[PDB]
Amino acid sequence: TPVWNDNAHGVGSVPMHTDLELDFSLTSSSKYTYRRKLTNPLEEAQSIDLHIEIEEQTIGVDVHALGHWFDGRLNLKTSFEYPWHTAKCHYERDYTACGLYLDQLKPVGSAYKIITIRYSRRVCVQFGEENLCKIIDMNDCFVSRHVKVCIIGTVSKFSQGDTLLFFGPLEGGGLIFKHWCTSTCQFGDPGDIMSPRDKGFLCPEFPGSFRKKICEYDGNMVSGYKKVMATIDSFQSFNTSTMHFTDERIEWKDPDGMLRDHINILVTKDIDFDNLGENPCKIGLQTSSIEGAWGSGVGFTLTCLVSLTECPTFLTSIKACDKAICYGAESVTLTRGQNTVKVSGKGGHSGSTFRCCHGEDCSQIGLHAAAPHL
Amino acid sequence: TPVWNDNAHGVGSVPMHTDLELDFSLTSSSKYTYRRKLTNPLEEAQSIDLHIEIEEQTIGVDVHALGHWFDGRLNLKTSFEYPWHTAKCHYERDYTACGLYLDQLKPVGSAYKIITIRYSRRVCVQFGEENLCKIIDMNDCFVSRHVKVCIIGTVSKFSQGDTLLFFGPLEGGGLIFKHWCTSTCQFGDPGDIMSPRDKGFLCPEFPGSFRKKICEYDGNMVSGYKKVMATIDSFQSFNTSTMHFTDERIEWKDPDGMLRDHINILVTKDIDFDNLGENPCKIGLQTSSIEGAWGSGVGFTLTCLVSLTECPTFLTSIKACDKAICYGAESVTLTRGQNTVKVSGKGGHSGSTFRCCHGEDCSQIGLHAAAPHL
Amino acid sequence: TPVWNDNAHGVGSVPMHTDLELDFSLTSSSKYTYRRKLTNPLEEAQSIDLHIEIEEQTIGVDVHALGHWFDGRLNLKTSFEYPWHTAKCHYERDYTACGLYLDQLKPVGSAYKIITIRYSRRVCVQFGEENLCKIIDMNDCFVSRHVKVCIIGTVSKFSQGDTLLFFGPLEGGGLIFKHWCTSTCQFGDPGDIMSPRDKGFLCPEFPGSFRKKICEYDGNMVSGYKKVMATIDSFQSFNTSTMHFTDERIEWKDPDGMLRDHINILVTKDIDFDNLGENPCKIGLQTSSIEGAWGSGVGFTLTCLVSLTECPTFLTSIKACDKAICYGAESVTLTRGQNTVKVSGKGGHSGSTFRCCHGEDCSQIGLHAAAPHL
């Protein structure tokens, strides 16, 4: 007969036994503070200090670092071992030999492929001498005995698969590219000339033809960087503040003040809220195996061994997390005893050890995923 | 003076005459159950059984089935009726004849073009001996005399125009392509070699040049499938559960437990809610004509003859539906007597008979739309 | 100790001291009207007229007008000053001279690049003899002493960077293109042949090769318009109603009745709401400088000189606006005295004079931004 479930983040309330509601649309890039002494109607001398602090919206993007994009010049030469044999990016016809090669290479920016986008606000609530701070994801709720804070919002600026380009120390801003070349890179494309890491170019294709007249090449001669700069107003910029780059992840606060989200704060002073996720179930967790990759839009799968006690069944979520960042979650009805739960995730880096987690509790160790693009 | 309107799905309430509110963020891939005996404060012995069941979020995607994508090898031959004349996909130069043809063809997956995306949850509410189940679309509300259930959410995983690729019996997962070739398919593109149905290839272009030295071809020689596999981590996977393929439609439950939506449940025990859509207007419906296409991003238009009685005017919505799936809706202020209402829709298949509908009531017959891509 | 903040648009309420709540999901393309006499329980003879009018959802899109897209025929000629020298779009090989040129040109539609998308509803509230109308952006709130109206919604039909094509006097509808050519336009692409203004073509590239046999060209010979028409069902249409084109901006009401948003209306009859943005701070504004461009996805930056009095600090937003349309906003904690605030914006046209604004108050003059695509 019991069907415990903690996937509901929120409360049951009696609207007559609720004392305060704050409901408002808040500038995404703004913090908010509320302070009030909660006093009895007139029939006491007891007051409770309420102090709520909501921080500015933060974006967290799991990415794959693509390395640097380059500008360069396409040069044509004739040989009748070719002179341009040392050039990393080249193309030749063997009739008299005609040759193309890239030179005057210069990095113009750092590119990042978006894997996951998540927005959040840090929310701190003091009620009496209770003090609790939590990072609340957009469309999730802060839940406590006396205070509920729900954030509801939508943003459509960034999409998975977008490529972000930063031209300089671009704590400041960047460009969004929706068509960065991937499976086919031709000279002239956004992303045409890349260096994924320190050394080594991924060279673009040269789709045109040679003619042996003095060699000629009848394909495009203009680099992707120059073609993009020539129509730069066609592309979308974004701005950033307090950037935080870590391996395969970027966090910042978008200073775009045109964006808003919705905040609802409900307070009960005397009788506790009914926490809709309340349960007596107890969970133990360890990792079993992993497969798949970090830094990948295809992702990984973490297998967890999950022990349930004190309940016959428990509907809940098991997460793949590391250092308080979660990369995936699986909703599951656990049965008493041992359970095997597979969690699909995306993101992380080579040093990530993905742990099996429930709520704020995690396994003692995690597992590494494989590298992408091998 | 009267201005009846049923486009508002919700209730007017007096916050003092409301007995229970549930407000929470729910894992999209999780169900939720609430059971409670509603009892009088202390001054009676009468109790009402409240039982709410909210099912896991379902996605319904109206699609155009594109057929199978193929891998293949590009072969080059010389003829001085060509040997490769039986090859379906070929390219030749007539000087000595040089020829390209695709062979070693193999289907690698099934592709589907997204036309419409809609999310929903089935919601069942028992209040006393009243029992009602409804499929509630995201950002719509369940309305009854004593209980309101509103679902508010946003998802940004899929977009109209995306192409979904399933590699095997991919009850399991698939890939999202945002640049599947349409108006120009060149060999090497995602989607380059397609077979729309049983037999018959839509062949890709071969943009390169021949040279008569022994023939040479200086264009790309690598299939789209191989180019995509070589950078597979650049593409976004998704997972599925309890898939349901029907003609030009796919439904499933996304097991991504990182996604949440918002649920609000309001209960009044004694006095009924004010149903904001309440009205005495009566509607009769029949189809008149149709034009446009199923399986098409451009869509169709259903013309309806709509009779209004018992009201001078009625602001409402007329829908194009078949078998309890709706494909389009037009908001309209009807006038007493006959009205002509055009409803723009998208989706459906060759067997669809699009009916004119109001609320849960539909015309006796529907009309077929035309096929796309003729 | 004081920390005034007006970035919160909403109210604090005591759920016992609230008299009416309307909560509902409303068809986006529908208006809504609520009329009620607010009367005392039984212990008075005083009534307040409540009258709420919510208008249909409007979309406002800041765009860059791209001019007209053309259909045309690619012709091949041989010359052994070339005949086709007057043709604006041409390509030649100088061996006998082979030539390509476009002719039979015809405009097929007008194209617009999406820079910004915003949805809104005009909301009018009469409470007693108080009457106030405001345009409320989606995910913002109408706030008054006795009535709060919040709109919460999400739409995923249009995206920044999409190109909208209108084929005729397309008050009626249009097509969405997600891959309109920008940095590389080749003959055959959507957007291949453009005329940005009255005269002057931006000609596409012809990536193929000539051969001197009688000249031959082995590249694509089919215009982008014809290639798109041949697979028109692959593209997404949209419909429009009551269109309003102005320079670099389009407004309309989307008649898609499948879309909904959420409306919440809270009314207190006696005691005023606590306006969460209430403050004694006073602001004076003038422009200082501007840089950047209108009609550009990169945008502009307006520098404002902002004087704060009556408060030590004030957390607020400074906006860049002209004629009651706002193009950007910066959240900022002002300090008493003079402040310099930079506001990033996008949109507008050559005649726009971007002003520094706070709430409904603006500077006496604004500044012009520079033209894009120079």
Ligand SMILES: *[C@@H]1O[C@H](CO[C@H]2O[C@@H](C)[C@@H](O)[C@@H](O)[C@@H]2O)[C@@H](O[C@@H]2O[C@H](CO)[C@@H](O)[C@H](O)[C@H]2NC(C)=O)[C@H](O)[C@H]1NC(C)=O
């Ligand atoms: C969720 O999807 C993953 C991803 O694997 C699928 O990806 C699709 C894009 C498509 O290519 C499909 O063919 C492929 O299976 C599933 O994980 C995979 O499962 C297979 C079968 O056991 C393994 O061979 C793969 O190594 C494995 N990959 C990863 C990264 O784990 C997964 O099974 C599926 N379901 C769940 C519940 O996660």
Ligand SMILES: *[C@@H]1O[C@H](CO[C@H]2O[C@@H](C)[C@@H](O)[C@@H](O)[C@@H]2O)[C@@H](O[C@@H]2O[C@H](CO)[C@@H](O)[C@H](O)[C@H]2NC(C)=O)[C@H](O)[C@H]1NC(C)=O
């Ligand atoms: C809503 O749009 C449809 C779609 O037709 C338009 O599609 C645009 C993409 C663009 O190509 C435009 O030129 C085109 O008209 C309209 O339906 C069309 O109406 C015309 C005129 O009567 C007919 O010739 C078409 O057959 C018809 N097509 C379909 C599929 O019905 C429609 O009129 C418009 N308005 C409403 C209220 O639906």
Ligand SMILES: *[C@@H]1O[C@H](CO[C@H]2O[C@@H](C)[C@@H](O)[C@@H](O)[C@@H]2O)[C@@H](O[C@@H]2O[C@H](CO)[C@@H](O)[C@H](O)[C@H]2NC(C)=O)[C@H](O)[C@H]1NC(C)=O
């Ligand atoms: C917000 O971003 C703008 C845009 O400028 C940036 O755009 C990125 C896409 C990238 O190219 C980056 O290199 C570039 O700086 C910033 O405005 C720019 O600031 C620089 C430095 O002072 C000026 O040289 C530019 O003229 C100026 N451009 C515009 C349009 O104003 C801006 O500084 C940044 N921060 C804020 C708070 O707005």
Ligand SMILES: [K+]
């Ligand atoms: K080549």
Ligand SMILES: [K+]
């Ligand atoms: K060719």
Ligand SMILES: [K+]
């Ligand atoms: K060429």
Ligand code: NA
């Ligand atoms: Na060529």
